[PDB]
């Protein structure tokens, strides 16, 4: 987290809980157009439909783009963009390794961009 | 949270499927064998996004089965320790809260909650309420939490959670 | 130790073991309890067709009843049997249990209203100290007016929608942002534009409850789009964006208006329909054997048209994954149309037309996106709870019937036969402590060793003298094993007593401690003898644990009802019957077989009973009088006043009244009753003879007790007269013998529904002695008729798909057809 626990996940792309939803529902509408789905996959789809804070693909693409120009660690682009802290303060109370990394000024601006995109 | 890591598998394909569509059978057996397996090295695997390449299929000497090495990109849920994650509470007990982070089932101890909140029996939404019902957590509540200890059973993976940080409450 | 606290205090034990703490009433809270409990539990049309096996004045009865339970802390038995005048005619003992149960619900409702009134108060204060939403006294009025816990959820949701986003209240750990974007629209201040719609939510709720335009739409002299420009911001650039945000606000404020949600709730309660479809798995797995066949498809089935437990089965199918169901108010003239007409202005100007279009589409979003979903889920929960209660009532009736059977009608000596093929047998004492054990391995040559077994049957019947022989119906083998003993009687009666409880006794670890060496079917025969001797004692003994009592089978679906409620219902049936019979404690102080009875006496329970028996083992004395109990056993006046009128004492061990259904507090009157049969001399005067039941002038004693004593003791005097007539007359129905249907059902282990005529079944053809004769796995005889008959066409030795044309319960006829013309349609 703050320091990373494994050695292999750091060079692995991190996904939001809304990229996952649009990828997982794509797999379904592939499947019934084509066997029955997994219990884990279906119930994870229900979980990520519960927390789909961006219902449209281009919104997720824009959110990922914005956080990409912000230049923060690839773990952090998914423990913010789907945690949607509302106050820069909320956000940092959340990421013990984000305080000190970024100044306070851009925090409200980026966070308000996330709550705008929902 | 949900990663996208390339990983490996070895499909032992039986000689029945040596027809014109053996590669499709490799793909189908990858989808059948991989999805749902809660490996502790690589977390939960939810869906196989794509199959990079179906490798050279080595015929096993004396066994008939062909071992196919498959590289594949799959959606992966590995919730690292010290993470703040959005659960969905499924049931309430005296010992704490049993929640569902998605694929993972999670636990919150009776002292892993803020101490201001207490169990409420004899209500068919059995719940942990405060004394003035400022925040009450019944079934199906999108509570944030902090996963502090992740432990592996090699059949399913469960992590434990707490709620002593700012905002770690109902949404 | 909480065990010590329970053992010490003078409350009824189940009062102390209640989740809610017990507290008194002030005759105003008590009247509110009575009226609310009556309206919510005794006169309320169940949505489902609930049949079973009262009146407005019951409120007073409930009133009176509640008084006891809350004030003098009288448990339900002590109220039910003695203070009958205050509750009877209407309040049966089961209705008193229902009053108790709904009291624990009313207490919870007041607790939640109390805290929430408190909260609204603090919030109102915060508001004052502080476009604007006012905590008027109407809010506190509805909060006090709350009657159900469903309304109390509406009021809470209403309060959370507007004033919820106020954490600094506890200031005088922050709130997580709510998922609805209504918070965002309120940050952007669209609520004012939401106000610019004609009606406020409350006025539309009044329109709904009155079904006409009691309030009038307030048109705004402009175009909605032109107001939209005033509000467009970064959050909502387009005027259509602010339009839709305002529509969403109007929808969410209509949804969380308690008047609107209440009226729509009532509409669902009256006019709602259940439509079922099968999933693909349910399009395959559903067959005629599956319980889903009767409803695999359904359309426009009103929720009020359902039956005993249909909805429980429907939800079971939906949980498995077979069915996709939906409860909707409109048919498949929609109820929205009334909503639209109430929220409508008829002015034909383009401005008013556009404002009305916005209003009606916003209220469409309110009705579909918010209200249908929540109210359908709530109605589903209510129907499921109704079905679970039905199942629990069915299990209660099963336990009632099994417990409503008298001991014996020839200390009774009984031999029990329990065939598994090693058959065993055990002989029961006059008090239950087994005398001996014996083995009679009857098997079907060796058809002469079975005659030898019959011979030793006769010899042991000549040696030991049992008044009844009992055979455990376990297979169809006992359908003729009764023949294998009944003629041996000629060299005393035979009864076929079922053995499922005996099977539990076999697997009972407690019984294994009782019988370490006795083989399984031998302990089963023991328990069969104990049951036929007295069912209640054995039921209390073996079913003293949750798993033990639950491992019996009262209903097929009993695994799908709330376990705690089922335990409570079965335990209250146990308590009912135990207190009706009474408990002779000094017998149980030596025989452990009866000990499990004592806990089911009112006031007393699982703790006070063990403490009492251990204390008597400290004195190592016999309880000859209940005065001895109160003095030596040092039992408080309340627990004594509860459990005295039911703890039997054997008089042949000294107030004889201790062996009667006469409470100590009412001893004196009883004496006076015997005095008017002309005390110490009268101890035997009516005991010896019911010389003149017309000697006692009932009305005169009743009016005298009204004038100088305590009034309305009429039925009490009648009870004392009937009790002095016969002491502890058991009212359990005299033990009959199983009818053909009962015998059929036990031996076949199958039910009239599972004996479905039309059922495609498995079968086994053994031998033909005319038509084809087969046997089921149950062992019954299935006759394939000659009319449907050739050896080659139907061979011998294998199994074949077959349909049950005709059945019989005394012949064990299971007639087949096997013709493929029948296997379809």
């Amino acid at each position: 987290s703050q320091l990373i626990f494994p050695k292999e996940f750091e060079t692995a792309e991190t996904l939001l809980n809304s990229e996952v939803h649009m990828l997982l529902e794509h797999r379904k509408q592939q499947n019934e157009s084509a066997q029955e789905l997994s219990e884990v996959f279906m119930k994870t789809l229900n979980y990520t439909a519960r927390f789909s804070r961006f219902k449209n693909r281009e919104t997720i693409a824009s959110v990922r783009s914005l956080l990409l120009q912000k230049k923060l660690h690839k773990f952090e682009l998914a423990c913010l963009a789907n945690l949607c802290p509302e106050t820069a303060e909320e956000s940092k109370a959340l990421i013990p390794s984000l305080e000190g990394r970024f100044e306070d000024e851009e925090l409200q601006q980026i966070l308000d961009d996330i709550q705008t995109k929902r | 949270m949900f990663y996208h890591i390339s990983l490996e598998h070895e499909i032992l394909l039986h000689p029945r499927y040596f027809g014109p569509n053996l590669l499709n059978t490799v793909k189908q057996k990858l989808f059948t064998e991989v999805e749902g397996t809660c490996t502790g090295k690589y977390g939960f695997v939810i869906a196989v996004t794509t199959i990079d390449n179906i490798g050279a299929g080595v015929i096993q000497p004396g066994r008939g089965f062909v071992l196919y090495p498959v590289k594949y990109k799959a959606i992966v849920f590995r919730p690292f320790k010290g993470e703040v994650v959005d659960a969905v509470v499924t049931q309430v007990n005296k010992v704490g809260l049993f929640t569902e982070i998605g694929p993972m089932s999670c636990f919150i101890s009776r002292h892993s909650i803020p101490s201001e909140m207490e169990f409420d029996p004899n209500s068919n939404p059995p719940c942990y309420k405060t004394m003035d019902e400022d925040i009450v957590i019944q079934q199906d509540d999108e509570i944030r939490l902090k996963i502090v200890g992740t432990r592996v059973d090699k059949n399913d993976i469960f992590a434990i959670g707490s709620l002593m940080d700012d905002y770690l409450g109902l949404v | 130790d909480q065990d010590n606290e329970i053992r010490a205090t003078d409350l009824p034990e189940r009062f102390q073991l209640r989740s809610i703490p017990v507290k008194g009433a002030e005759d105003d809270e008590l009247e509110e309890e009575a009226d609310w409990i009556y309206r919510n539990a005794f006169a309320t049309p169940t949505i489902s067709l609930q049949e079973s096996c009262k009146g407005p004045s019951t409120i007073q009865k409930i009133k009176e009843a509640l008084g006891f339970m809350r004030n003098q802390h009288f448990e339900v038995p002590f109220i039910a049997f003695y203070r009958k005048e205050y509750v009877e005619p209407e309040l049966h003992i089961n209705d008193l249990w229902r009053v108790w149960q709904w009291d624990e619900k009313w207490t919870q409702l007041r607790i939640r209203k109390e805290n929430l009134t408190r909260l609204f108060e603090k919030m109102q204060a915060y508001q004052y100290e502080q476009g604007i939403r006012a905590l008027d006294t109407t809010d506190m009025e509805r909060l006090k007016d709350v009657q159900s816990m469903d309304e109390l959820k509406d009021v809470y949701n209403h309060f959370l929608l507007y004033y919820g986003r106020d954490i600094p209240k506890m200031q005088n750990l922050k709130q997580a942002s709510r998922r609805d974007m209504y918070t965002i629209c309120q940050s952007a201040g669209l609520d004012g534009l939401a106000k610019k719609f004609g009606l406020t939510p409350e006025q539309f709720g009044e329109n709904l409850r009155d079904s006409y335009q009691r309030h009038e739409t307030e048109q705004f002299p402009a175009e909605p789009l032109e107001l939209a420009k005033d509000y467009v911001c970064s959050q909502f650039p387009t005027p259509e964006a602010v339009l839709e945000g305002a529509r969403y606000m109007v929808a969410l404020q209509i949804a969380r208006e308690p008047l609107v949600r209440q009226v729509l709730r009532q509409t669902f309660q009256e006019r709602a329909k259940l439509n079922i479809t099968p999933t693909k798995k349910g399009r395959k797995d559903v067959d005629e054997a599956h319980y889903a066949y009767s409803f695999k498809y359904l359309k426009n089935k009103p929720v009020k048209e359902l039956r005993d437990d249909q909805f429980l089965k429907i939800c079971l199918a939906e949980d498995e994954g077979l069915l996709t169901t939906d409860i909707s108010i409109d048919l498949k003239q929609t109820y929205f149309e009334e909503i639209k007409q109430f929220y409508y202005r008829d002015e034909f100007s383009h401005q008013v037309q556009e404002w009305n279009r916005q209003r009606t589409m916003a209220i469409e979003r309110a009705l579909q996106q918010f209200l249908y979903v929540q109210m359908a889920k709530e109605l589903k929960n209510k129907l499921l709870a109704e079905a679970k209660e039905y199942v629990i009532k069915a299990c209660s009736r099963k336990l009632y019937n099994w417990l409503r059977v008298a001991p014996y009608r020839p200390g009774i000596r009984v031999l029990g036969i329990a065939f598994s093929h090693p058959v065993f047998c055990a002989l029961v004492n006059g008090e239950g402590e087994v005398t001996d054990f014996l083995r009679l391995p009857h098997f079907t040559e060796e058809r002469e060793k079975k005659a030898q077994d019959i011979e030793t049957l006769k010899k042991f019947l000549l040696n030991k003298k049992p008044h009844v022989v009992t055979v455990a119906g376990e297979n169809r083998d006992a359908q003729m094993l009764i023949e294998d003993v009944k003629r041996i009687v000629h060299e005393i009666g035979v009864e076929l007593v079922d053995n499922e409880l005996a099977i539990l006794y076999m697997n009972s670890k407690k019984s294994e401690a009782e019988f370490r060496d006795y083989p399984p079917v031998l302990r089963q025969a023991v328990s069969l003898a104990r049951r036929i001797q007295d069912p209640l004692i054995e039921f209390a003994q073996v079913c003293s644990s949750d798993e033990d009592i639950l491992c019996l089978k009262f209903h097929p679906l009993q695994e799908h009802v709330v376990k705690e409620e089922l335990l409570n219902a079965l335990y209250c049936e146990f308590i009912n019957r135990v207190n009706e019979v009474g408990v002779d404690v000094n017998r149980a102080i030596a025989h452990p077989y009866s000990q499990a009875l004592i806990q089911y006496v009112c006031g007393l329970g699982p703790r006070k009973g063990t403490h009492l028996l251990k204390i008597l083992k400290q004195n190592n004395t016999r309880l000859e009088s209940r005065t001895q109990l109160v003095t030596m056993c040092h039992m408080g006046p309340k627990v004594f006043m509860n459990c005295a009128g039911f703890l039997k004492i054997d008089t042949a061990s000294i107030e004889v009244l201790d062996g009667s259904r006469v409470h100590p507090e009412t001893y004196e009157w009883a004496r006076k009753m015997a005095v008017d049969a002309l005390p110490a001399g009268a101890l035997e005067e009516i005991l010896e003879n019911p010389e003149r039941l017309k000697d006692l002038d009932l009305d005169a004693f009743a009016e005298e007790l009204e004038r100088q004593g305590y009034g309305d003791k009429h039925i009490t005097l009648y009870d004392i007269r009937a009790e002095l007539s016969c002491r502890y007359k058991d009212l359990r129905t005299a033990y009959r013998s199983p009818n053909t249907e009962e015998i059929f059902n036990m031996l076949t282990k199958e039910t009239p529904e599972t004996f479905y005529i039309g059922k495609l079944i498995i079968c086994n053809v053994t031998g033909i002695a005319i038509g084809v004769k087969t046997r089921l796995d149950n062992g019954v005889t299935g006759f394939i008729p000659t009319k449907f008959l050739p050896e080659e066409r139907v061979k011998v030795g294998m199994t074949v798909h077959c349909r049950i044309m005709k059945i019989d319960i005394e012949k064990f006829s299971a007639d087949l057809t096997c013709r493929t013309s029948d296997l379809m349609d």
Side-chain angles (χ1 to χ4, degrees), chain C residues 169 173-180:
Chain C
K169 292 189 292 185
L173 322 179
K174 295 173 71 175
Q175 182 179 2
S177 172
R178 292 287 183 274
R179 186 179 70 189
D180 52 2

Side-chain angles (χ1 to χ4, degrees), chain C residues 519-704:
Chain C
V521 298
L522 183 61
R523 301 177 304 258
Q524 164 173 351
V526 174
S527 67
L528 290 147
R530 315 189 103 157
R531 165 151 169 185
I532 192 51
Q533 209 173 34
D534 201 25
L536 182 62
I537 320 181
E538 183 60 340
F539 266 105
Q541 193 63 90
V542 58
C543 296
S544 56
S545 192
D546 291 331
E547 287 77 2
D548 295 335
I549 182 56
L550 282 155
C551 283
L552 282 72
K553 276 303 280 172
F554 315 85
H555 205 267
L557 294 182
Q558 88 190 12
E559 318 292 341
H560 309 283
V561 295
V562 179
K563 174 171 71 213
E564 281 186 40
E565 184 178 1
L566 201 79
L567 273 295
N568 195 256
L570 307 185
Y571 274 9
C572 67
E573 297 269 9
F574 265 107
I575 285 166
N576 287 13
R577 184 58 52 183
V578 170
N579 291 293
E580 189 279 337
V581 166
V583 161
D584 178 271
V585 65
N586 63 7
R587 186 273 304 278
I589 205 67
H591 296 51
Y593 167 55
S594 177
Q595 284 190 48
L597 277 296
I598 62 171
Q599 56 162 351
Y600 295 101
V601 181
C602 69
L604 192 150
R607 314 291 180 52
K608 302 182 172 308
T610 55
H611 154 91
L612 183 63
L613 61 84
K614 278 306 149 194
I615 291 305
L616 277 296
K617 285 181 174 65
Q618 292 318 95
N619 296 317
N620 295 95
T621 55
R622 309 211 317 185
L623 275 152
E624 285 98 11
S625 171
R626 291 195 293 267
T627 72
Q628 170 190 138
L629 186 152
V630 66
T631 54
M632 172 259 270
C633 309
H634 52 276
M635 181 175 258
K638 298 170 71 67
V639 180
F640 178 82
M641 211 195 318
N642 285 296
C643 70
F646 308 106
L647 292 174
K648 293 191 177 179
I649 295 170
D650 186 74
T651 44
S653 52
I654 299 280
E655 291 324 303
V656 69
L657 281 293
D658 292 329
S660 59
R661 283 166 194 171
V662 167
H663 202 256
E665 72 168 4
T666 181
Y667 278 161
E668 317 296 320
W669 292 271
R671 300 205 204 281
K672 318 317 168 219
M673 293 176 70
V675 164
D676 284 21
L678 303 178
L683 282 183
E684 293 80 4
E685 289 301 78
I686 312 95
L687 178 148
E688 65 183 1
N689 290 317
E691 76 284 16
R692 293 185 295 171
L693 283 73
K694 304 298 183 291
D695 200 325
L696 188 153
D697 58 357
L698 291 152
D699 294 4
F701 292 102
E703 291 153 281
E704 286 190 13

Side-chain angles (χ1 to χ4, degrees), chain C residues 411-590:
Chain C
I412 299 297
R413 184 163 262 142
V414 175
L415 191 43
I417 308 296
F419 75 98
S420 184
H421 325 303
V423 185
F424 274 69
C425 64
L427 189 69
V428 66
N429 205 2
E431 270 64 41
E433 284 212 346
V434 64
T435 61
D436 74 275
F437 61 94
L438 180 73
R439 167 203 280 96
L440 285 54
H442 302 210
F443 38 85
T444 183
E445 294 180 354
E446 287 179 352
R447 301 185 26 97
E448 317 306 323
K449 217 174 161 176
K450 183 190 183 69
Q452 194 262 329
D453 301 333
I454 293 174
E455 195 272 336
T456 184
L457 269 165
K458 328 193 192 59
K459 293 295 186 291
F460 210 83
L461 293 178
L462 295 159
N463 189 2
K464 270 81 171 176
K465 282 71 57 187
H467 313 77
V468 168
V469 59
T470 52
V471 295
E474 179 159 307
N475 297 115
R476 199 186 179 276
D477 291 330
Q479 213 270 322
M480 258 67 68
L481 206 70
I482 65 172
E483 325 284 349
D484 276 30
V485 174
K486 72 178 182 66
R487 52 164 60 90
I488 294 88
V489 162
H490 294 109
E491 291 83 2
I492 296 92
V494 63
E495 293 304 338
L496 191 152
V497 62
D498 200 359
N499 62 6
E500 76 286 339
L501 175 86
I503 294 170
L504 281 293
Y505 192 74
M506 171 180 320
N507 314 337
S508 189
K509 178 260 288 180
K510 168 155 308 288
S511 159
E512 206 59 46
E514 301 215 320
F515 301 140
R516 63 169 320 121
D517 57 284
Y518 303 70
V521 298
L522 183 61
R523 301 177 304 258
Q524 164 173 351
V526 174
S527 67
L528 290 147
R530 315 189 103 157
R531 165 151 169 185
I532 192 51
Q533 209 173 34
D534 201 25
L536 182 62
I537 320 181
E538 183 60 340
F539 266 105
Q541 193 63 90
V542 58
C543 296
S544 56
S545 192
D546 291 331
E547 287 77 2
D548 295 335
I549 182 56
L550 282 155
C551 283
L552 282 72
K553 276 303 280 172
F554 315 85
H555 205 267
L557 294 182
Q558 88 190 12
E559 318 292 341
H560 309 283
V561 295
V562 179
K563 174 171 71 213
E564 281 186 40
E565 184 178 1
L566 201 79
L567 273 295
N568 195 256
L570 307 185
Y571 274 9
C572 67
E573 297 269 9
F574 265 107
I575 285 166
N576 287 13
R577 184 58 52 183
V578 170
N579 291 293
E580 189 279 337
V581 166
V583 161
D584 178 271
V585 65
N586 63 7
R587 186 273 304 278
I589 205 67

Side-chain angles (χ1 to χ4, degrees), chain C residues 120-169 173-329:
Chain C
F120 283 5
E121 310 311 304
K122 317 127 178 165
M123 172 73 228
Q124 189 144 358
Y126 181 114
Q127 156 166 357
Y128 189 2
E129 293 177 350
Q130 285 311 303
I132 190 66
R133 182 58 166 76
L135 277 173
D136 54 353
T137 64
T138 303
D139 292 337
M140 311 295 218
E141 190 268 340
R142 287 178 302 179
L143 185 58
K144 190 40 75 202
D145 188 294
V146 163
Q147 289 303 270
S148 60
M149 192 95 78
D150 313 328
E151 174 183 3
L152 189 61
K153 184 172 184 174
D154 298 5
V155 161
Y156 194 42
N157 280 348
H158 201 195
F159 170 69
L160 283 193
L161 172 57
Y162 293 137
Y163 327 88
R165 306 152 261 190
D166 291 345
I167 292 288
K169 292 189 292 185
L173 322 179
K174 295 173 71 175
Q175 182 179 2
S177 172
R178 292 287 183 274
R179 186 179 70 189
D180 52 2
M181 72 291 291
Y182 176 96
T183 301
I184 310 171
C185 302
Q186 188 274 331
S187 171
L190 277 296
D191 49 354
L193 177 48
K195 196 201 162 179
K196 285 320 170 191
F197 296 78
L199 283 179
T200 195
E202 204 281 327
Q203 301 166 320
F204 183 64
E206 292 175 349
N207 291 19
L208 282 195
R209 68 177 182 178
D210 303 344
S211 297
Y212 72 84
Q213 286 91 310
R214 158 178 301 268
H215 287 243
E216 286 325 285
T217 318
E218 282 85 3
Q219 291 77 238
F220 200 92
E223 180 71 28
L225 277 297
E226 300 305 323
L227 282 72
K229 266 77 75 175
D230 178 18
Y231 282 110
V232 296
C233 288
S234 60
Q235 300 297 107
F236 310 85
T238 310
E240 274 62 18
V242 290
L243 258 187
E244 190 277 332
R247 281 174 290 206
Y248 174 69
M249 281 215 167
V250 176
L252 188 58
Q253 294 165 350
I254 294 171
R256 282 172 180 42
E257 193 63 29
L259 276 298
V260 189
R261 214 190 303 187
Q262 183 176 5
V263 54
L264 183 63
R265 164 179 308 158
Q266 177 260 292
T267 59
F268 274 95
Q269 297 223 336
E270 61 157 52
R271 52 174 290 172
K273 291 106 193 173
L274 181 78
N275 313 310
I276 301 170
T277 81
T279 61
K280 197 177 188 297
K281 177 194 287 293
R283 216 145 58 223
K284 183 171 129 164
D285 272 6
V286 164
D287 80 352
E288 193 197 47
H290 207 272
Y291 46 76
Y293 181 101
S294 176
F295 46 77
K296 164 195 190 157
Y297 290 69
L298 272 186
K299 273 163 41 65
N300 309 56
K301 168 136 190 172
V303 286
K304 290 204 307 167
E305 194 179 358
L306 282 72
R307 282 286 294 169
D308 297 333
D309 54 352
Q310 208 153 345
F311 204 89
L312 180 54
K313 292 162 189 169
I314 297 156
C315 286
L316 279 183
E318 194 176 6
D319 278 309
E320 305 183 3
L322 282 72
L323 292 180
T324 292
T325 62
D326 63 280
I327 322 171
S328 162
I329 173 164

